[PDB]
Amino acid sequence: LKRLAAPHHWLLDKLSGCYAPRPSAGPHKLRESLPLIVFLRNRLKYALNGREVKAILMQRHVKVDGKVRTDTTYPAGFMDVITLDATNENFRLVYDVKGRFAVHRITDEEASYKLGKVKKVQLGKKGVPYVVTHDGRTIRYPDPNIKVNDTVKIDLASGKITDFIKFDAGKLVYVTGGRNLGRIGTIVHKERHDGGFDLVHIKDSLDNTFVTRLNNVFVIGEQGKPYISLPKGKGIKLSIAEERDRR
Template sequence: MYFNFYPLKQVAPDSWKLNKKEGTYAIRPLSGPHKKNECIPLAYVLEKFLGYANNRKEIQIILKNNNIKINGKIITRRKFPVGFGDVISIEKTSENFRVFFDVTGKFQFHNIDQEEALFKIARVTNKKIMYGDVPYIFTNDGACFKYCDPSININDTVKIDLKSRKVIEFINFSVNKVACVVSGDQAGRIGTIEAISEKITLKDFSDKIFSVSVENIVVIGENEESLLISFT
């Protein structure tokens, strides 16, 4: 099991890129929008990946001064869970990053412009008619939205405006769409959906075929030339 009250570095996810020879314990991420084995504590993002801090004291100063926003909200907790698709904004430096995985399943933080930092994407995990006959959809990052386009279905991808907190676009989950693996052993791989059955069959951009469970992928574009998010 990855997480005890004081999680051992030796069993922390490899995606965190920790030096497991230094120290014994790792930071335990708070409960939040991402599963604990699919996220990384904000402290490690600032220290290990972005290089804005060298120790806990520097991390606390950065957060105490309200310098960090995630998906448009100021975050002050160093254990806050950060995961795929999140937008990290540092207003003091006017920098924005979107969270991805590299092809080895390690976290990556892509520098994005201000326009792209205004939205994020998520996979629809459920849809229901709630109290007062109000239709809701629920996404893999723990969010819910009401009065969305009724043609949005489970496993579709929605584009979310981070200011209005509304769905502004969506892509149906279907054959020939481009998808990214966001969890599991093949996290970070990108390919075109070839077939949909018990497992989803994809072909990557090197024409290699692989299969994953549907809950492990997020559709990111209609085709290779039309992606919702950039990777450069």
């Protein structure tokens, strides 16, 4: 029960007692996930207090990416969907221009699937090739052109793969983690060191050639035709001073 220094992109109120919620074991890490208490209590405000959040979790109203997951401290981290059956809602939680967990209202035909970066492709047991992804869905029998640091498109009815975005020089990219969060565009340079500290450089509307760690990046799709929608003008971070200079 160690707390009061949470990941400060959760933005919980500081005069809200003393502690802060401990995300349990789950598909994502500690300081890059967001549990449903912080979601439904001080991020969109559907329930006032945490035991009422436990009531709406226990009453089967919420399902993260297909099944219910009746748990308060469930670390449903990045890129998954939350299909609130009542309110007709499909919260995909994605990132923003500033570092927070922006929300969407996804259509049902896009909320029927999710995607994610792989972490390794291995041979598991009895000579069966299986891949993993970033949220622990170790799924069997891929197409064996799946490479490391690539994205598959999980079907979310079954755990099958419908398509994959074989990343190379020049297919549209997202970022996650680091001080260059929430940016798009993949076409300047493709650096490859020996031991990390490398990026596929970024090109945007203002063509900002940017880099970060290769662990801090993953793909979406084709340039101009993305697989996921993106919030508030497909986040760019031009400048707030230029925004207040123009409009």
